[PDB]
């Protein structure tokens, strides 16, 4: 389990999780606030 957490701490897995979080956050913001251009 320690080795599995080290594997999850490796670089492409963290890039995948972090870009999934960032893309989902932007997707959620563009859903609930549709089409923002200003402010």
């Amino acid at each position: 389990m320690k080795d599995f957490t080290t594997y999850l701490s490796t670089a492409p897995v963290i890039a995948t999780i972090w870009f999934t979080f960032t893309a989902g956050l932007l997707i959620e913001i563009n859903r609930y606030f549709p089409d923002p251009l200003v402010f």
Partner: protein
């Protein structure tokens, strides 16, 4: 003695080596110091020969890898069936195949991408799919979304079984090397069980499920009203109502009175006129014959009993005066080198995929397929590309064998040796014939361009000026069309409409008509011959000179993949066989792009179109326009690019976006192909200085990509760009004019 041989518990299942990147390589297990390491880690991840010298461990690794691939493919099939059941218009399409467009992908309503869900009919909105799954599913007799859902669950379960099989046969019970080396037994089991029992069980499903359901679908009864398949197995009286042969049961089979099975095992030929596909009775007879043939073929090699042939004995028996020892040593080569096997299997698997493309366009096997012009173009093009890639791969792994596994002290005056020993003659003759083909094939086009530009059309190579008729192909075509009358008496029609004859139309569209070959067809076929010969030249030169040349006498010691041997001796860039694969990749792209252009223009000009006479999609301009480059430039690319360039504001807008994106990626590749890593390393030096100034220089040192990686990135973005460009062009064109 053929038997099961297995080692118990060789490799422990543990997450430890997941947490140590590059564990498999003694060099890469030291850790990263520069950025090059990462790329190496992914490049050498699956090169199992460079991991261990033990053929057994390598063989086990490739076995479990193959299981992983099969599990991935099963996940993919599961996905296609599930999306076909849950997010499609398949039932509506079943109720009206001629006026509903097959769609099995829907997009979510965010950031305006909702427009991609277009009006495909059936009260549905989505992206029209061109994989041909709907026609496959109707041909298999599927009628409801529930059956597709159950197929999805089944394929997912099978994927879990494949990944368990991988884990099991690597970590728990891993086969021994003498298990893997039982190639005679492997051929017997694969020819009998795989191909033989495969086509036998499929013919079983066809005869018992496909034929009645599709006979009712062609009769016109509502799919929901059609009896479920299990009722067809259960009550043989219904089977006897549709085909009275089934009343007598399996008595004519065992009593050898097979003529009474003529209701569902036919030899009609042609296409089903109300449906535009091959007769499923012909397909059932075909799979029964194929089954019996392969089950006969699978009992050829000796295993644990005296009967049966021996592969090494058949090889060592064929020796002549011209070739010396002949096929001696080839058995030893093909039972110890995975790369040789991969070369052979890739060559025939690619060639087979190209044959699949041609035979599936020419003899449409699925119902309502020939008139789904987008599906036909997509399938032909796709399988042609897959084919070409596998051929280039064959050349690659042939060369990899030549460098790593070739050992002449078991291979001394042999077929392979003599080929190596007269390679200069081989390459020089191939060289000359490539230049000859290039000059006369391309020169006719340049000649025509010049004459047309100079206002002298009577001096061109065309059907009205200096004619160059494909007399041989026309003769073969005529013979094929006249074959049912004399040389195939039991055939009611020719095997394909393209030989000649009448015209089969479905829903006002042309399914297939006779294809005529003239001067333009002569010219494109010799262009094809030229490009194929050049690709063969590059790849074959790569494999024959992989070990040595007059330039690099000891090239074998430098490996398969290496940048060069320095700027000396005039310059030795791209001397490696890998670099020959790299150039062969570009030439393969060239060849197959002209092939799919030939197919697209010829079908839209002389075959497809609506029936009122037939009004073709491009009016029949091929015969007069396909003799000049300006003709291809204007009447094909420029003319048919209208749909892609004006696809904005509609559901096809994604094809415009991917048109532009693909152009961009193609161009982006030119930086890697045209430049070199010295410049980039120095640029990175300046940038590293800037990062050092602000205490943000990484501990893993930024390095420019290697020479070979620059070439690899280059050719990959080049192929992706060009192929995706033609993809967007093709799909937008054929969907809007289809």
């Amino acid at each position: 003695k053929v038997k099961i041989a297995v080692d118990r518990n060789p490799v422990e299942t543990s997450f430890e080596k997941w947490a140590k990147p590059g564990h498999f390589s003694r060099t890469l297990s030291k850790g990263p110091n520069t950025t090059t390491w990462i790329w190496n880690l992914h490049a050498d991840a699956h090169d199992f020969d460079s991991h261990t010298s033990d053929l057994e461990e390598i063989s086990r690794k490739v076995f479990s890898a193959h299981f992983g691939q099969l599990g991935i493919i099963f996940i993919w099939l599961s996905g296609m069936y599930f999306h076909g059941a849950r997010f499609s218009n398949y039932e509506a399409w079943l109720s009206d195949p001629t006026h509903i467009k097959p769609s099995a992908q829907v997009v979510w309503p965010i950031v305006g991408q909702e427009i991609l869900n277009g009006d495909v009919g059936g009260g549905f909105q989505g992206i029209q799919i061109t994989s041909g799954f709907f026609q496959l599913w109707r041909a298999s007799g599927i009628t409801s979304e529930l059956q597709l859902y159950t197929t999805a669950i089944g394929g997912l379960v099978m994927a879990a079984a494949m990944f368990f099989a991988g884990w099991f046969h690597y970590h728990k019970a891993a086969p021994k090397l003498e298990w893997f080396q039982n190639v005679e037994s492997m051929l017997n089991h694969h020819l009998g069980g795989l191909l033989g029992l495969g086509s036998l069980a499929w013919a079983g499903h066809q005869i018992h499920v496909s034929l009645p359901v599709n006979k009712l679908l062609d009769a016109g009864v509502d799919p929901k009203e059609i009896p479920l398949p299990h009722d067809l197995l259960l009550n043989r009286a219904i089977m006897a109502d549709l085909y009275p042969s089934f009343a007598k049961g399996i008595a004519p089979f065992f009593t050898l009175n097979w003529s009474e099975y003529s209701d569902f095992l036919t030899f009609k030929g042609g296409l089903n006129p109300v449906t535009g596909g091959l007769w499923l009775s012909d397909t059932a007879h075909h799979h029964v014959a194929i089954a019996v043939l392969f089950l006969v073929a699978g009992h050829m090699y000796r295993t644990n009993w005296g009967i049966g042939h021996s592969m090494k004995e058949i090889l060592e028996a064929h020796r002549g005066p011209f070739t010396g020892e002949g096929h001696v040593g080839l058995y030893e080569i093909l039972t110890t080198s995975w790369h040789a096997q991969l070369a052979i299997n890739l060559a025939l698997f690619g060639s087979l995929s190209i044959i699949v493309a041609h035979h599936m366009y020419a003899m449409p096997p699925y119902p309502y397929l020939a008139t789904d012009y987008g599906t036909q173009l997509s399938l032909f093009t796709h399988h042609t590309w897959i084919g070409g890639f596998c051929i280039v791969g064959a050349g690659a792994h042939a060369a990899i064998f030549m460098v790593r596994d070739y050992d002449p002290t078991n291979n001394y005056n042999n077929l392979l040796d003599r080929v190596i020993r007269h390679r200069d003659a081989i390459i020089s003759h191939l060289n000359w014939v490539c230049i000859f083909l290039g000059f006369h094939s391309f020169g006719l086009y340049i000649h025509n361009d010049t004459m047309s530009a100079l206002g002298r059309p009577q001096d061109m190579f065309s059907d009205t000026a200096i004619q160059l008729q494909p007399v041989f192909a026309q003769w073969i075509q005529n013979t094929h069309f006249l074959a049912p009358q004399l040389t195939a008496p039991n055939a009611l029609a020719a095997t394909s409409l393209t030989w000649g004859g009448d015209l089969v139309a479905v829903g006002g569209k042309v399914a297939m008509m006779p294809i005529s070959l003239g001067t333009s067809d002569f010219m494109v076929h010799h262009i094809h011959a030229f490009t194929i010969h050049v690709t063969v030249l590059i790849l074959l030169k790569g494999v024959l000179f992989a070990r040595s040349s007059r330039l690099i006498p000891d090239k074998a010691n430098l490996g398969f993949r290496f940048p060069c041997d320095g700027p000396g001796r005039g310059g030795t860039c791209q001397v490696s066989a890998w670099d020959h694969v790299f150039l062969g990749l570009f030439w393969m792209y060239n060849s197959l792009s002209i092939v799919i252009f030939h197919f697209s223009w010829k079908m839209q000009s002389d075959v497809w179109g609506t029936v009122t006479g037939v009004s073709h999609i491009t009016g029949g301009n091929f015969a007069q326009s396909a003799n000049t480059i300006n003709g291809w430039l204007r009447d094909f690319l420029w003319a048919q690019s209208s749909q892609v360039i004006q696809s904005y504001g509609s559901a096809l807008s994604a094809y415009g976006l991917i048109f532009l994106g693909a152009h961009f990626v193609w161009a982006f590749s030119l930086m890697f192909l045209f430049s070199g890593r010295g410049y980039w390393q120095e640029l990175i030096e300046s940038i590293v200085w800037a990062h050092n100034k602000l205490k943000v220089a990484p501990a893993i040192q930024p390095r420019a990509l290697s020479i070979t990686q620059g070439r690899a990135v280059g050719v990959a973005h080049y192929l992706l760009g060009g192929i995706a460009t033609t993809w967007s062009f093709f799909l937008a064109r054929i969907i809007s004019v289809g």
